[PDB]
Design a binder for these strands. Structure first.
Lengths: 244, 195, 8, 341, 130
RNA sequence: GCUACCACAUCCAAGGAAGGCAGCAGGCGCGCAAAUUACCCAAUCCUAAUUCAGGGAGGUAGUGACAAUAAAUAACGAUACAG
RNA sequence: AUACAGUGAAACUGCGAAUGGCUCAUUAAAUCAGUUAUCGUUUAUUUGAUAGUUACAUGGUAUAACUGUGGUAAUUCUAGAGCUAAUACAUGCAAUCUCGACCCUUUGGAAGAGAUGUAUUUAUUAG
């Protein structure tokens, strides 16, 4: 094509969303935002097809304009707002907090969390670079530009961000033995400890990961997200703890 | 004077009775609602004295007694009104029996030391056979074939019976007068037990 | 849990 | 917004909602969860609020108090702990859980009215702090709940509070004299309900006290309180308006009362005269006219002029049925002062 | 008699209502009109009739039973606020909006497009001309 | 959308003026033959100064032995007469 | 509502109309399927960061809609006059941080010295 497409059809939509094929012809096209289109769950799907809360898109629109939905501590009124991995969705009226984490099946799961856990999130360090006026900053997996980072922070690290202030509370270095969550490929969803990182200069780096069941697998580095130390995840994990 | 005030009065009187009876108050209130929770809470088997039980057999005129149903009023904590149908029936215990002779009979069993005492009865017979021969027209007031079951409503207002006439006849407790007859509408819809 | 009813 | 756009939904400011808001539970004819009660008002509302409200703090509130509310004697026997739990959680001031808690507070009073009297002082103080807290976080719904809760308590304790109505307002003086207008306005409506149910004898004691207080924003508050008390429906006045009013003037014309009270009588007069039509006011002008004639004296001559100057100016002469009666009073007032008036 | 049973009751605070599935047992009868269902669901759930919505009712083959969906709003105003227009018109809570057919409206639109400005000045000019 | 050009063609009081879809339906292509120029944006989505406006995107309905699935058009007795 | 405050035809601004739909004539690594790079690039919008360097508010350098006079057989054809606005068009405005004597008070005040936009092009230095 010679320009951006504006419509998203269903059979071409991401499979993990689990839309009914016959109910209609088109699926919500996720608007531009922090996450990739294929790696995002639009708020309409989360509110209607997942929580079963709303019965139709118009209800979702009324709900959103009522300002009852907050994404990462900010009210969002776009029906196709692209919520994604490690995003905190808060519904104060229902007293509900959710973190978007893929299940072992590879689908985003409805994982309820506490307010204390909801107060923060994690961001994998995509880039570390000096800005104008010689101001260092980090770009995370969600597109957050955070200035004045800790120098020890490097790419592939994971920074704990406070939603209210958007500041790094702590960080995790990428190293062997660290607890890790897989975010892509056939092997999406499970959790394991880093064993060894294969480095191929001019090529995609590969990481070996061992699960609690001692089973070992290999993945590309891009699909890796450090989430804590073994036995000490910094977030509450979904049921199954990323096994199988 | 308002109904809520009446409940406040009854609740206040109820508490005074509990205070007169007496920890113990708290436990009893829990026992009052133990029925709602589906678990056994009446452990009194070891307390029972079967050996010293006063056994008694009361003969009656009916041939082949088929079933007996007993009614016990219970104080409702939730409105403080006894399940007795009327003021005269306050704390009166009634037992209803059916036999193959097409009689429904009620007895008073309030006095446990004394034997059941007959109050009223009703007989059925060939007078009550249906002429139509149709199941939906089988709405005669009385029984004409063997009566097998009897059950008393928990409210103490009605008692229901059924049998080889393929009928569910509900009777007024006080007078044993027929108020409704509900056919089963089946050739082999034979009532065998009522609960 | 729901509620139950009947008329006529 | 005289002309309304095509939209079904339109923005409304917090002030705009507040301006439209009115505290009067009785006009609301919607079916009320406590109208059908099989055991108690609290439990009847309590189960309904359990399924509707999913807020956190209410969820712990239900668990703490679920066991002790199953029956009325349990409520009466455990009334102390129920009230303490209710007050503690209302103190947290969470909009998401106030509505059930505030509603249950009113229904709690409904179950044990005379017994709630020992709780009455604490309950009012709890509401006042909530309401003073509610101004910080703008939410018209929160104000509606507490004021509706306040009106409900007055309705259920109407008999007892009326005997000591002066005590009831003494609790609400900070609300009635509060700087912000609507809190005084709304609090005035709740008290006006109690005033409309007060006997004339107890009313005279009450009117004397408030006039004594009058001797910041109290003057406006009592004006709103009294005018609300007389007014019932458009172009009409309440039956007790004749009795409520007749008490007011006698103390006003009484020398012991301050002059500021007579100004309030004038201020009360325009609002009812402007609000009400001719026919509804005919009982009023009679007990105007008879009372002023009866109590005319040289010592109170300055006060009689002022109110009569008020009547003639009120809506010009349209609201006055017969001018001749006023002329006769002049000839009397002339016969029996201040030149300016 | 006729029985009605509510199942799958879900509380919905932020739209301020209750969802459930309605099962209507009507032996020896065709079915129950939606209005009767609304009024008695109002009686049982104890809300005003206007706050009650019922729809999607289908009778089972052979008769005697039907299944549909039921909504009970916390208030009449909330129902008026969130609840679809066409269904309020079903309940009479809203008045049907009279509009012309789509082709008529589109012809109006195109012909309006070909005029520029209010056209009152064109009207007075042609009036003076003729 | 504009300029000049090459053709087609529409009007004029003859001085000029202006004109370009098999997308949706409905047609021609034989002298021999086939679904309606239907209803709606209620749904799912998309665009906007945006809940509310719109969308021949789409949906709804209309026709028919191209195909495919299931089944009516009767069921039960009595009597009389003949070999 | 004595600036207006309501909605609101028209008009000026802002956004969009490169999406969607339809047919298969063409072309044998031509697109294409997988695969790789952009340290070789542009990117509305979204999201997150990000700019202390007459003013109690300038002009028509301005007109639409609108009023009024006309011409033409006549068009989303027209000329003469008269208005009037902006997120349209042009113009444009007594602070901070360091080294810090006095080591005066020992958190601290503090003499004095200093230092202080962004955008484009070229050159240079550090990296």
């Amino acid at each position: 094509a010679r320009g951006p497409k504006k419509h998203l059809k269903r059979l071409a939509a991401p499979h993990h969303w689990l839309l009914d094929k016959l109910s209609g012809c088109y699926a919500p096209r996720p608007s531009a935002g922090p996450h990739k289109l294929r790696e995002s769950l639009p708020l309409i799907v989360f509110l209607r097809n997942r929580l079963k809360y709303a019965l139709n898109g118009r209800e979702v629109k009324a709900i959103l304009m009522q300002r009852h939905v907050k994404v990462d501590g900010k009210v969002r009124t776009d029906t196709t707002y692209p919520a994604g991995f490690m995003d905190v969705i808060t519904l104060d009226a229902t007293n509900e907090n959710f973190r978007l984490v893929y299940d072992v099946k590879g689908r985003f799961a409805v994982h309820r969390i506490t307010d204390e856990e909801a107060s923060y999130k994690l961001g994998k360090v995509k880039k570390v670079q000096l800005g104008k006026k010689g101001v260092p900053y980090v770009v995370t997996h969600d597109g957050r530009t955070i200035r004045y980072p800790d120098p020890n922070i490097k790419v592939n690290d994971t920074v704990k961000i406070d939603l209210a202030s958007g500041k790094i509370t702590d960080f995790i270095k990428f190293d062997a033995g660290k607890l890790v969550y897989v975010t892509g490929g056939r092997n999406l969803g499970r959790i394991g400890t880093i064993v060894h990182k294969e480095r191929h200069d001019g090529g995609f780096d590969l990481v070996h990961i061992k699960d609690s069941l001692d089973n070992t697998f290999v993945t590309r580095l891009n699909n890796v997200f450090v989430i804590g130390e073994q036995g000490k995840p910094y977030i509450s994990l979904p049921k199954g703890k990323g096994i199988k | 004077e308002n109904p809520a005030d009446k409940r406040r009065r009854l609740a206040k009187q109820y508490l005074e009775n509990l205070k007169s009876e007496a920890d113990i108050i708290a436990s009893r209130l829990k026992e009052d609602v133990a029925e709602q929770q589906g678990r056994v809470f009446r452990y009194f088997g070891d307390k029972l004295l079967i050996s010293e039980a006063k056994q008694s057999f009361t003969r009656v005129g009916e041939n082949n007694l088929t079933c007996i149903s007993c009614f016990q009023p219970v104080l409702n904590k939730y409105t403080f009104e006894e399940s007795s149908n009327g003021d005269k029936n306050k704390g009166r215990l009634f037992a209803y029996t059916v036999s193959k002779d097409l009689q429904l009979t009620k007895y008073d069993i309030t006095d446990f030391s004394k034997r059941p005492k007959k109050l009223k009865y009703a007989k059925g017979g060939a007078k009550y056979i249906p002429t139509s021969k149709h199941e939906y027209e089988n709405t005669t007031e009385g029984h004409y074939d063997e009566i097998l079951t009897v059950a008393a409503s928990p409210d103490g207002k009605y008692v229901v019976t059924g049998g080889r006439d393929r009928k569910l006849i509900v009777w007024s407790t006080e007078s044993l007068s027929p108020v409704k007859v509900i056919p089963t509408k089946d050739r082999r819809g034979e009532v065998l037990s009522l609960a | 849990k729901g509620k139950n009813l009947s008329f006529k | 917004q005289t002309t309304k756009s095509s939209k079904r939904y339109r923005y409304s400011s917090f002030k705009a909602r507040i301006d439209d808001l009115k505290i009067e539970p009785a006009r609301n004819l919607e079916k009320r969860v406590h109208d059908y009660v099989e055991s108690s008002h609290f439990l009847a509302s309590f189960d309904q609020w359990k399924e509707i409200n999913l807020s956190a703090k209410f969820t712990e509130f239900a668990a703490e108090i679920e066991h002790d509310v199953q029956t009325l004697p349990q409520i009466l026997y455990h009334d102390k702990k129920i009230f303490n739990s209710l007050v503690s959680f209302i103190n947290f001031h969470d909009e998401f859980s106030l509505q059930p808690l505030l509603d249950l507070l009113a229904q709690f009073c409904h179950d044990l009215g005379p017994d709630f009297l020992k709780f009455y002082e604490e309950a009012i103080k709890t509401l006042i702090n909530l309401l003073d807290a509610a101004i910080e976080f703008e939410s018209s719904n929160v104000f509606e709940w507490g004021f509706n809760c306040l009106a409900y308590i007055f309705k259920y304790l109407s008999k007892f509070l009326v005997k000591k109505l002066v005590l009831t307002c003494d609790l609400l003086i900070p609300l009635l004299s509060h700087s912000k207008e609507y809190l005084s306005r709304f609090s005035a409506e709740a008290l006006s309900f109690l005033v409309r149910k007060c006997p004339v004898s107890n009313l005279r004691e009450f009117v004397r006290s408030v006039f004594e207080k009058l001797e910041t924003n109290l003057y406006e508050g009592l004006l709103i309180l009294f005018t609300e008390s007389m007014t019932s429906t458009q172009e009409t006045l309440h039956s007790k308006a004749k009795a409520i009013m007749s008490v007011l003037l006698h103390e006003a014309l009484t020398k012991s009362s301050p002059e500021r009270s007579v100004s309030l009588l004038s201020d009360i007069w325009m609002n009812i005269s402007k609000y009400a039509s001719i026919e509804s006011l005919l009982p009023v002008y009679e007990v105007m006219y008879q009372d002023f004639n009866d109590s005319l004296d040289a010592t109170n001559i300055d006060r009689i002029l002022k109110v009569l100057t008020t009547i003639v100016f009120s809506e010009s002469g349209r609201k006055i049925p017969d001018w001749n009666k006023i002329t006769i009073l002049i000839e009397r007032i002339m016969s029996q002062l201040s030149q300016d008036k | 008699a006729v029985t009605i049973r509510t199942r799958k009751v879900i509380s919905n605070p932020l739209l301020a209502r209750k969802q459930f599935v309605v099962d209507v047992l009507h032996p020896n009868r065709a079915n129950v009109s939606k209005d009767e269902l609304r009024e008695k669901l109002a009686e049982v759930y104890k809300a005003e009739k206007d706050a009650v919505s019922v729809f999607g009712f289908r009778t089972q083959f052979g008769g005697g039973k039907s299944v549909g969906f039921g909504l009970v709003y916390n208030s009449v105003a909330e129902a008026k606020k969130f609840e679809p227009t066409y269904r309020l018109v079903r309940y009479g809570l809203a008045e049907k909006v009279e509009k012309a057919s789509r082709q008529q409206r589109k012809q109006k639109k195109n012909r309006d497009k070909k005029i520029f400005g209010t056209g009152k000045r064109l009207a007075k000019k042609v009036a003076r001309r003729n």
